[PDB]
Amino acid sequence: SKYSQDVLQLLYKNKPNYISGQSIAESLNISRTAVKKVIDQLKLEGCKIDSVNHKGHLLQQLPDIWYQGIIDQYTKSSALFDFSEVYDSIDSTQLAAKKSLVGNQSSFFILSDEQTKGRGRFNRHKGQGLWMSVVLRPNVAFSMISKFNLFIALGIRDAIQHFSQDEVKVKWPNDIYIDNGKVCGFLTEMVANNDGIEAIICGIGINLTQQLENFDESIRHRATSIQLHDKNKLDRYQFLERLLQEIEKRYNQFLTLPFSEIREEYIAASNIWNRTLLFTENDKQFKGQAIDLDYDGYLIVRDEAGESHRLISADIDF
Numbered sequence: 001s002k003y004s005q006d007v008l009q010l011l012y013k014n015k016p017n018y019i020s021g022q023s024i025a026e027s028l029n030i031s032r033t034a035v036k037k038v039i040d041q042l043k044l045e046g047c048k049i050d051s052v053n054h055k056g057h058l059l060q061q062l063p064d065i066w067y068q069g070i071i072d073q074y075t076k077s078s079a080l081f082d083f084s085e086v087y088d089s090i091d092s093t094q095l096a097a098k099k100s101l102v103g104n105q106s107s108f109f110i111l112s113d114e115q116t117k118g119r120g121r122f123n124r125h126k127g128q129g130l131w132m133s134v135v136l137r138p139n140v141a142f143s144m145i146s147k148f149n150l151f152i153a154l155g156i157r158d159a160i161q162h163f164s165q166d167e168v169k170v171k172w173p174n175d176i177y178i179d180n181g182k183v184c185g186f187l188t189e190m191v192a193n194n195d196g197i198e199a200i201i202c203g204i205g206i207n208l209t210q211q212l213e214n215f216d217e218s219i220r221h222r223a224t225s226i227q228l229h230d231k232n233k234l235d236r237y238q239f240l241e242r243l244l245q246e247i248e249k250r251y252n253q254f255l256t257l258p259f260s261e262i263r264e265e266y267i268a269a270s271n272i273w274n275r276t277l278l279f280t281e282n283d284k285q286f287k288g289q290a291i292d293l294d295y296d297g298y299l300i301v302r303d304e305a306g307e308s309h310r311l312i313s314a315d316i317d318f
């Protein structure tokens with residue numbers, strides 16, 4: 001309905017208290033019967049609302065569906081994001097972000113329940129995943145894109161880790177794993193010129209509400225979900241809030257710290273050591289061992305032929 005997310009916004013905003021249907025009616029200037037219709041449908045979409053006579057309604061639990069009205073409360077208090085666009089469907093949050101950033105300097109993120117044309121690095125190709133693009137505006141040289149990628153890696157990792165009993169680790173430079181299972185991929189893009197960066201665009205894809213049980217019985221050998229490693233149930237909104245808070249903390253770190261400061265923490269969180277890696281670049285594939293991540297975010301590799309490589313970026317397979 002026209003007023004669904006306003007009612008949702010009021011219900012969420014008032015937790016942990018009950019709120020009366022009259023209050024909602026007065027707040028939106030609609031009748032108490034119109035409110036009942038909205039709240040009923042809220043329930044039939046899977047919203048869990050407790051309604052007791054004379055006292056009102058209490059939002060107890062949100063379903064596995066993004067609601068604009070809820071996310072507006074997140075951007076309301078955010079010292080980072082100016083707004084957010086929530087979609088049930090879209091070709092790609094990244095495509096939407098790259099269009100919406102043009103002509104302005106606002107910081108925002110774009111969320112969609114499903115993507116019809118999601119693309120990751122090199123143009124590689126249900127409500128069980130998080131698909132989000134984040135637009136930030138750091139006043140830095142375009143060289144610093146590699147450095148941003150390193151920082152938010154730890155941010156995304158920390159958020160997933162908080163909900164995972166098993167340990168979450170980074171496959172440099174663009175992926176997150178829990179044990180053998182890849183749980184997230186992300187890429188960092190930018191709009192820049194010689195004089196600096198006009199925007200950072202960070203697309204993040206995370207296998208979410210996929211409770212042991214849940215997640216699709218496919219590649220249970222190298223793909224996993226956050227919740228196949230959480231005893232309790234995983235709420236998307238509790239996760240998203242933790243994820244945004246970590247993105248902001250790591251973003252400010254990116255602005256204030258050299259990579260030297262977070263480097264040892266990054267290495268302790270990487271799963272690329274002490275194993276033979278497969279490197280793809282263009283024509284050629286070759287095997288190698290990662291020796292070190294140097295002071296500048298460059299991976300130091302010794303290939304199977306003994307030769308040394310120093311790579312800002314890489315396409316790595318296990």
Ligand SMILES: O=C1N[C@H]2[C@H](CS[C@H]2CCCCCc2cn(Cc3cccc(F)c3)nn2)N1
Pocket residue numbers: 091092093094095115117118119120121124125131132133184185186187203204205
């Ligand atoms: O459109 C969009 N992108 C972004 C945004 C929101 S999600 C984000 C991209 C997320 C990418 C992570 C998922 C993923 C994994 N892989 C691995 C792969 C696939 C195929 C061949 C291959 F060698 C490796 N590819 N994608 N909106």
